[PDB]
DNA sequence: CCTGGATGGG
């Protein structure tokens, strides 16, 4: 059976996929397609400029329905290219189960006539420049209006979006309104008291006042950041906030006692006035972000009495001549009983010590600790031992120099305290500078100019450390003691650290791995370890290597002292070998990697024979990489049976033929890739029987030979539910005038 | 609100 909704995709939940098609207008799917199945409909990124009453007439249980980016104005479009979104009028209407709808980034004037089982629509990015009570009277379930975008740089329009006094008042139910880059000078008048999100940022709105906020009281988010700009560091066009403003009266949000979310970033605020806070018992979160209150922050007493407020940004509150501030945080921070998270990055300030941030030290909930982009250049790190409950600090990309004077790699999310001091101006490592700092889990010292010698001095208090990320560094050379003082070390970095000059007249000792107890993760890529080097890794514990971008190729090129480099690593599960420039490989090579071994990669060397018979060697592997090499072939041998394999593969190579049954034996085999290639065709006896057991099936990007009637058609047709993208991403190479096009495409849907 | 540090998403 051809697929349902030519040229689109049917995907899980009801959804057909009709995005980035370059379609005229919307396809009038086949009497034969299970229209009553399409609960959701995505037209992204097309070019349909006209609307019919008939296009989603039949589709009855139809509840989403998104056609953004099909008609942009002229100000969003690349070439300035006008265009005006024709739309019959019942186009909507016809469609009397649709809940949601995207019209953003399209030429409408007005508000198409949309029934009333609509709850959320979007009209961000079009030209509608007046919303009055008749736009969307009767939308009485509609709880989401977002219309941002209607009046501003990339899309104009001469004056302000009228918004009339209770446009909106008809809105019972709605709770959510965006409003933003519309170029208000005020806040509409008397919006629905149902609102819960009201975000009206980004306007020109200087002056604010209780009366704006009129029986507002349900308000839980309230963002009016934006509207009057410090513009020294953007970027696109931006007007600057006129000198004597902002004004907001003091008691301004005194009635929003709901409120749990405040936004005034960039605003142009030189002091806070502490009546703005009074009366929001339940504020959870400030933003207070790219302003000017770098001196405000040493003395204010604002934060007295925000005792739920958990997050608080303060980032970018600069001296505007781009300079350090001098910094205390005054003791009001103290009244944040309940703060979790305090983002200080990028307001500039050069020492941090026990007086920078006292107030914080005893909060017992503060865990997220924003730092990084400050300049600062005499840290303290013992400040932080004694935090009673922090988790992370971002100290990256500062100027510290020292003391005071996945499936290879796991991240330190979950872990329970986090250090990173990445693309700071570290030459040498002291080991005092951790001195306090016992409790760490996960330390992130990468991108510093690091170039001294590891041999076990170096971190010395670290006695929890579990993750050690010193990548992108120029550490010199590596011993049989180095990374030992650390007892319980887990996932250890060194990729991107090469000095093969500086290494005295000798190489690396790896010994260290097999020292090791706790050590699971280990990665040595691109160290370009040509030569000069160990003999065997040997590891009991480890459990994924990376060995990716180094030059395996020469360690096995030179005779057979290399040959069972990677055999130690008795417990082994990954390895990845990509980027080593393996131009061959020998039978007794790949005989000598862990039995254990159930992911290889080997992507991106110069591969073009591979022995498939010698994958009986690996009676564990479950997944094999070889994109991007140079096979011509899938020959020499098939796959062997009894083999565990799932995932092969073979993508971004020159596979112009398979011999058949190649893929018949591999009974667990569930995920193929053959994308990218030389392939002319696709054939069943590749797979023998068992055909429909792939899940995953991957033959785009090939040179398909779509000759009427080809003999791939009645195959893929027959496993479609297995290959992604077939509708449309699935080509022909030839001949001439089908070339690029989908091998369903007008001149061969008559040919099937 | 989320996201970054500029802006666009829901
Ligand atoms: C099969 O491999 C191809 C190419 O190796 C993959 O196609 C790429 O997909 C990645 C994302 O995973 C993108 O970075 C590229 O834009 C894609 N490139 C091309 C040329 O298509 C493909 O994803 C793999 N197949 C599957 C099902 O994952
Ligand atoms: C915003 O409104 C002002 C005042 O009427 C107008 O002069 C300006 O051009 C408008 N901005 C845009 C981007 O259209
Ligand atoms: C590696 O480990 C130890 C240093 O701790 C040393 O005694 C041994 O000789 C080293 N091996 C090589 C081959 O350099």
Not at 69 to 76: E, S, T, V
Not at 103 to 109: A, D, E, F, K, P
Not at 481 to 500: G, H, I, K, V, W
Request: aromatic share 8%.
């Amino acid at each position: 059976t051809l697929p349902p909704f030519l040229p689109c995709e049917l995907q899980p939940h009801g959804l057909v996929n009709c995005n980035w098609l370059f379609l005229k207008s919307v396809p009038h799917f086949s009497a034969a397609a299970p229209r009553d199945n399409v609960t959701s409909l995505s037209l992204l990124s097309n070019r349909i400029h006209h609307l019919h009453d008939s296009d989603f007439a039949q589709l009855s249980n139809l509840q989403k329905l998104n056609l953004k980016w099909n008609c942009p104005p002229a100000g969003l479009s690349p070439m300035h290219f006008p265009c005006h979104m024709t739309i019959e009028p019942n186009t909507f209407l016809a469609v009397p189960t649709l809940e949601e709808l995207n019209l953003s980034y399209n030429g409408i004037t007005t508000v198409p006539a949309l029934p009333s089982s609509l709850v959320s629509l979007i009209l961000s990015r079009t030209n509608i420049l007046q919303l009055d009570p008749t736009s969307l009277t009767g939308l009485h379930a509609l709880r989401f209006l977002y219309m941002d975008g209607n009046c501003y740089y990339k899309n104009p329009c001469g004056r302000a979006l009228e918004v009339a006094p209770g446009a909106l008042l008809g809105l019972g139910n709605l709770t959510h309104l965006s409003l933003k880059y519309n170029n208000l000078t005020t806040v509409p008048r008397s919006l629905p008291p149902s609102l819960e999100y009201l975000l009206l940022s980004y306007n020109h709105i200087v002056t604010l006042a209780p009366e704006d906020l009129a029986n507002l009281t349900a308000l839980r988010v309230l963002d009016v950041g934006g509207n009057c700009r410090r513009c020294d560091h953007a970027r696109n066009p931006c007007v600057e906030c006129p000198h004597k403003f902002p004004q907001l009266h003091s008691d301004t949000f005194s009635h929003l006692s709901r409120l749990e979310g405040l936004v005034l970033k960039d605003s142009s605020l030189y002091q806070l006035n502490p009546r703005w806070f009074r009366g929001l018992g339940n504020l959870t979160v400030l933003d207070l972000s790219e302003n000017f209150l770098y001196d405000c922050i040493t003395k204010t007493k604002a934060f007295q009495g925000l005792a739920q407020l958990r997050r608080l940004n303060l980032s970018f509150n600069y001296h505007k001549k781009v300079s350090f501030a001098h910094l205390t945080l005054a003791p009001s921070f103290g009244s944040l009983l309940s703060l979790q998270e305090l983002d200080m990055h990028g307001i500039f300030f050069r020492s941090l010590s026990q007086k920078t941030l006292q107030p914080l030290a005893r909060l017992p909930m503060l865990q997220r600790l924003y730092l990084q982009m400050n300049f600062i250049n005499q840290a303290q790190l013992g400040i932080f031992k004694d935090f009673p409950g922090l988790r992370y600090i971002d100290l990256s990309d500062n100027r510290i120099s020292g003391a005071v004077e996945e499936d290879f790699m796991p991240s330190c999310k979950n872990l329970s305290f986090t250090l990173d001091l990445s693309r700071n101006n570290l030459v040498t490592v002291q080991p005092e500078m951790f001195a306090q700092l016992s409790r760490l889990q996960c330390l992130r010292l990468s991108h510093n100019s690091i170039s001294q010698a590891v041999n076990g001095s170096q971190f010395v208090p670290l006695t929890s450390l579990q993750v050690l990320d010193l990548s992108h560094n120029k550490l010199d050379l590596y011993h049989g003691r180095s990374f030992t003082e650390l007892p319980r070390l887990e996932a250890l970095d060194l990729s991107y650290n090469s000095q093969p000059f500086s290494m005295r007249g000798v190489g690396h000792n790896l010994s260290f791995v097999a020292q090791l107890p706790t050590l699971r993760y280990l990665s040595l890529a691109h160290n370009g370890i040509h030569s000069r080097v160990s003999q065997q890794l040997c590891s009991t514990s480890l459990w994924a290597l990376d060995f990716s971008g180094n030059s395996l190729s020469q360690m096995w090129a030179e005779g057979d002292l290399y040959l069972r480099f990677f055999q130690g690593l008795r417990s082994l599960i990954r390895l990845d070998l990509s980027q080593n420039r393996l131009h061959t490989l020998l039978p007794c090579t790949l005989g000598n990697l862990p039995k254990s071994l159930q992911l290889l990669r080997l992507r991106n060397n110069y591969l073009a024979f591979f022995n498939w018979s010698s994958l009986t060697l690996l009676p564990n592997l479950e997944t094999l990489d070889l994109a991007g090499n140079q096979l011509k072939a899938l020959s020499n041998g098939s796959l062997p049976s009894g083999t565990q394999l799932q995932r092969l593969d073979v993508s971004r190579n020159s596979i112009i033929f398979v011999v058949p049954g190649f893929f018949a034996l591999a009974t667990r085999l569930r995920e193929l890739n053959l994308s990218a290639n030389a392939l002319r065709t696709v054939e069943p006896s590749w797979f023998g029987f068992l055909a429909g057991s792939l899940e995953v099936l991957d033959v785009s990007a090939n040179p398909l030979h779509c000759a009427c009637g080809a003999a791939f058609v009645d195959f893929l047709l027959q496993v479609q539910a297995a290959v992604p993208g077939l509708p449309s991403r699935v080509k022909c190479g030839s001949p001439g005038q089908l070339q690029g096009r989908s091998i369903f495409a007008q001149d061969l849907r008559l040919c099937l």
